[PDB]
Amino acid sequence: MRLEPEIKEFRQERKTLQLATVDAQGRPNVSYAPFVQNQEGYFVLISHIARHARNLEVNPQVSIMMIEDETEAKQLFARKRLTFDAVASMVERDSELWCQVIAQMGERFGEIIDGLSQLQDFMLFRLQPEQGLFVKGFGLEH
């Protein structure tokens, strides 16, 4: 497959981001979150109870990775993946952006989003890429 269409198929199939966040003193945390993406950036809906949400609140930098499953990988030392760093911003509840992304998320993930989007500790973060994109295992590399 050609590079560009393979990237597209991958972004459409993968439902989760792996995230590296940091607290105010720069202690690292790794976590994951289901996501949707659109013209405004990548969006995750996560719990303030968990560290990654409290981290993105105080220190709005994230390293993001979208990666194929261990069991799907031809080569474990070369998992097909897309990686990029981003700047995090919280999305105001019930704002126009909020309603759009929640809608999108419901469409991708279904009923579950109904409950989650009601809970006060669940915050919506917009993540916007800034320093490039790394792509491994696509096109000529597949």
Added chain:
Amino acid sequence: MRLEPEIKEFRQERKTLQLATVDAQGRPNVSYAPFVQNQEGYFVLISHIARHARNLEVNPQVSIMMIEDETEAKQLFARKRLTFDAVASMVERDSELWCQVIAQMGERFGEIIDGLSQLQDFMLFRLQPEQGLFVKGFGLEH
């Protein structure tokens, strides 16, 4: 399944760690690496060319996650997973621990290890847990 056997099964079946590292100014990076574990800690063999290896060298804190695959998860918003923070240290090439761990890795991962263990950019890091372990999706929770 009971908690303890379910954890045992997971660590045996899961072959990579997802890593959150930080550079000298505390900027996050997300990555992954095949691992082995033994009584000396968790071990990953990674390239100094890549950011995570240079991060671990200069700022040796890391957040580690072992996580079930996306396509296998019953619920995407509750992927079964183990998470822990750790301290990293570099293992001296051709030292006793190096030879011990390379043999273990070759056993888990096969001949690929023969090549990587000979590339000078590939370094062996020991990751040791310092602040307990978070267990999500096991035993009574399953």
